[model samples]
Target: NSVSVDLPGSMKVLVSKSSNADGKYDLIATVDALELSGTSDKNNGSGVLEGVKADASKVKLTISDDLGQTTLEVFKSDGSTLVSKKVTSKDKSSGEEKFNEKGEVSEKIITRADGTRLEYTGIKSDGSGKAKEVLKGYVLEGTLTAEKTTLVVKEGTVTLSKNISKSGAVSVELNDTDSSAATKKTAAWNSGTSTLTITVNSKKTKDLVFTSSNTITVQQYDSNGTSLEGSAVEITKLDEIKNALK
Candidate 1:
């Protein structure tokens, strides 16, 4: 038994050799075409078709141009999408794309200029899937396999939330903590750095604060809320204070 295919454009193929050799049939065929252009066969000049080619009628082609933008899509036999691509002249952008090995798109990647990237796999039709973002330091792998995201790093983990305002304000906070030290270590804009404030609830020797010109302050206090010694110390290097504290 043999099946023939009538392709569009100038390309046409006929399969007629069906031989039951030793009660088994193996059919080998070839077609010759230089330039094929038609509704079914979109080969302009150098498109090759081998093996059992799908019917041109089973494939759907569509193009859209709205607001000076051009987009093209190809649909398969089951009306499912095959390939979709778009480009616009007014915008210089590295547009997002989806990789679909089968009939439907299974994965997508979105990227921005300022080192912002997101990935999605097993995507739905409405463009939602296992979403993940690329951060600054460590890369989180095996994110799609489990409910909790795992970072690819060595020996430490913490959760932090970043905040960036519309007016270019930036702040960061440790989202979850039960210890007092972690909560107090959270910082923000207009905040003091390298200064440890001792309170009644805790007694600890913290680091000192300094200005740009290497002027440090030394304030020693007692348990009875009295300042024992207070002085302005001038230091050029941080090792000087570390050695003094030791």
Candidate 2:
């Protein structure tokens, strides 16, 4: 017959030879030459196995493949078993809606009594105002798996690119390592293309209309405590930021 091979565990290789040579009497199969990926607590400075021995029991197998795809697990010198990590959409904010020609609706975003708007786009969303399908990759979906997979899954690398918080905000400066520097220039509250811009009015005014899906918290300030008159007051916190004199 033919010889078969099984690679189980990180560094364990198992080979099996057919007992029945041709269509003849049969015996039992034998296992040999099991060289598989191996992980050891200690290894010599050189990239060589330190001890000339077999620690079959000290082997672990990890199966990794494409994301959004199923993976199987097997034990060395054992049976062939298939396993899968159950997965589901992390963000569930998808729903149908109808907009009129003028693109206006009575359905306004809920605002706190303090006048702060509250909004939460699903993990499956691109964080853009326009809602669309996520599975197609147009809109990213949140991951609810135990893998703790991030919202952004790099196609070829099969690695998590971005971690989306349950609150729908994608955590920034994570995993990039150098992201700490980029994070210093950005805030967690910032999202989408046209982010919320706080317009600080050191002056006075009436109503101010902001037309953006970006969430924002407004703060006001004045250097001389003298409010400018006739200024339509629109307080955006960022506009007031100036290099503070030490």
Candidate 3:
């Protein structure tokens, strides 16, 4: 049993010798007036396959199988892991984690059997933005995209409606009888760096009210529990966040 197919970048993927004692396969990365031969049958602790005798500096594959799960990892010539993927049979889940040149998780997504999914976009733990969160609120009859969220209740007619955005804009209305979106407040933040910004439009005024951007370092600590005063910038930023809510 043998099958072969042509790949886009002048490459070929082929599988063959199923009826033989040693079934083998080849990726055949490039076929530009060139051919490759297998070095030997490889059925080692890694896996079962044939080794190619070519410029394999760019080709590295690793696979490990446990009882309930399997993991596949690819490496670059510089000994850097490019990407890693795992699938589990017990949980009926599969995850693919992408990596950057720095070998960090650029993005990762896992889909479970129940159809719920989780994702982390780029390992930018610093103060930055690359957010994508889908929220279901038809049960509450309102949808929202968020990272930092707050329950905003601007009571005018005991009405509750919100038009929010991915950037955390809470578009609140006054009344269903007379439509005037008098109060809208947007709160944006970078939690890793503890930075925040607020934009709002009051019933009569509009302004960018407050921005919180400062940091503090702890010099020392007591054995159990003690406190060190915040720096001037840290204190002011915290107060500004409180006043921004006001």
Candidate 4:
């Protein structure tokens, strides 16, 4: 089944083969070709659908809003969700709200206007701002997931991503490959014969707001045990990146 929607800014769409909103369904694919009108290049708005009206018999979605806040969601076919983020109205703060495939709330990371950052896993979100110790400064500018590797920025989180600090996870050393003529800076994380390169446009990114395009490009290469150059494949292990970068 096909559907059309009218939404503010821009949105990403996912499709499924089932319609049972309760029992679970199967995801056909998250459509990447259907283009939205505009882009959410900024996060300085409210999450109000006071002017929106839509429907769904073939598929549906699960999203949220706290009046003046903005919430973005990505749901699957079986009534599950990928990962979503919310931009709260208070000082226009952002918190990365992650939801698992079961549509269950998972981990979270939030950055406040006062430079106070907070993080928590599971559904224990009430005390993140009160009881949790503030992680001063900014969040990681990247996120790494299995099966896919892309650049991301976190103002608490954004479409653009991070490396996790696990036990004994060393900070990955990246080579500064930026040239004076490029629009953004470039860096590469090297692991043995493999290399992961990332180009970032920092002008569109700051502590307050992060646009997806801030990451111009992310490329990973494998040298096949040679001189670590001229490779046809990209890096595949997400955990490898964790050990490569902080």
Model 2 TM-score is 0.17
The reply for model 3, stretches above 4 Å from the true place, is 1-66, 87-89, 125-246
Per-residue lDDT of model 3, residues 1-246, tens digit only: 334543222234443534234553432322333343231233222221223224442333232322233344444655446654443434556676767766766665555555434444644534122333222211112222344322232333333333334473434332223334454544444444333333334221112211221122112122222332333232232233233234
Q: Which ten residues in a row have the lowest lDDT in candidate 2?
A: 44-53
Per-model TM-score on C-alpha atoms: 0.33, 0.17, 0.32, 0.27
Task: Provide backbone clash counts, one per model.
Answer: 0, 18, 0, 12
Superior candidate under TM-score, 2 versus 4:
4
User: In terms of lDDT, which candidate is stronger, 2 or 4?
Assistant: 4
Q: Mind giving the per-residue lDDT tens digits that candidate 4 earns over 1-246? A: 523332222343322333454533222212233222221212222122211112211222222322234354444533244545454443556676666555555666666655455455444323221113133222333332322222333221112233323331222333333344333334444434223444344321111111121111222333332122332332233332332232
lDDT score for residue 72 of model 4: 47
Per-prediction CA RMSD (Å):
17.8, 21.0, 17.4, 18.5
- Residue 153 in model 3: lDDT: 29
Q: In what order do the candidates fall by lDDT, top score first?
A: 3, 1, 4, 2
lDDT of 2 by residue, 74-162 (tens): 22223222111111111211111222233222121223323332222232222233122122112333334223324442322122233
- Model 2 residue runs over 4 Å out of place are 1-142, 145-149, 153-162, 177-246
Off by over 4 Å in 4: 1-67, 77-82, 122-132, 137-246
Per-residue lDDT, model 3, residue 18, is 45
Give the better candidate number (1 or 4) by lDDT: 1
